[PDB]
């Protein structure tokens, strides 16, 4: 509804993280969406563990550093009954053995909602829910050396997506 939204201003977003050379972006997108929902629910912003998801969500369908899906990650947290914090379960950028410790579990999900494939519906969810997990086509050189401005790539695909990221808001430029 509003013309502009930026959840960073309301304390829903943790600092920018770095996945390194591991295809775990699906895990960063998932902890990103869960950090915002947990904050909205408790009023406390706590960085969640991507490594906990990389190491333990194989039964939900994830493949560690070789790919995965945000929904499988949300499914894992629900099936597992918890997700450890970043501090207690640091990111190593590699798949290791599952070392989930319930004692350090600071998050919990109940399921997930899939948004209809339309930008108009996405805007509504971003304005009312909080940061939203999304997948984009980031496999272009232009995306690599992006610095400022609005990114637009004529060769971008709406059907093939290779990178999970997090939508923290939207807006428009001055007039």
């Amino acid at each position: 509804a509003p013309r502009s939204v930026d959840w960073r201003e309301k304390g829903y977003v943790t600092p920018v993280k770095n996945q390194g050379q591991c295809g775990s972006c699906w895990a960063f997108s998932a902890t990103g969406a869960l950090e915002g929902q947990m904050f909205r629910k408790t009023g406390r912003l706590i960085s969640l563990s991507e490594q906990n998801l990389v190491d333990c969500s194989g039964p939900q369908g994830n493949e560690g550093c070789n790919g995965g899906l945000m929904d499988y990650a949300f499914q894992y947290v629900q099936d597992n009954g918890g997700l450890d914090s970043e501090e207690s379960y640091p990111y190593e950028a590699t798949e290791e053995s599952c070392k989930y410790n319930p004692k350090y579990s600071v998050a919990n999900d109940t399921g997930f909602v899939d948004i209809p494939k339309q930008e108009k519906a996405l805007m509504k969810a971003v304005a009312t829910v909080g940061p939203i997990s999304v997948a984009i086509d980031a496999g272009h050189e232009s995306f690599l050396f992006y610095k400022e401005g609005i990114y637009f790539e004529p060769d971008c695909s709406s059907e093939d997506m290779d990178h999970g990221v997090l939508v923290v808001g939207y807006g428009f430029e001055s007039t």
């Binding site: 869960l34 899939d114 930008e119 609005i150 093939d160």
Partner: protein
């Protein structure tokens, strides 16, 4: 152009605008931004 989605990337703060990127909004689903969107229920 004018409208954008504020997106948080995971390649560290050195990339883009402090780790963020303004993606074209309302350009008919540019880069598939609305093709696989979801959130968890808590």
């Amino acid at each position: 152009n004018n409208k954008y989605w504020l997106v948080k990337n995971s390649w560290g703060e050195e990339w883009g605008m402090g780790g963020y990127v303004k993606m074209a909004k309302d350009r008919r689903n540019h880069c598939g931004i609305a093709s696989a969107a979801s959130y968890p229920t808590v």
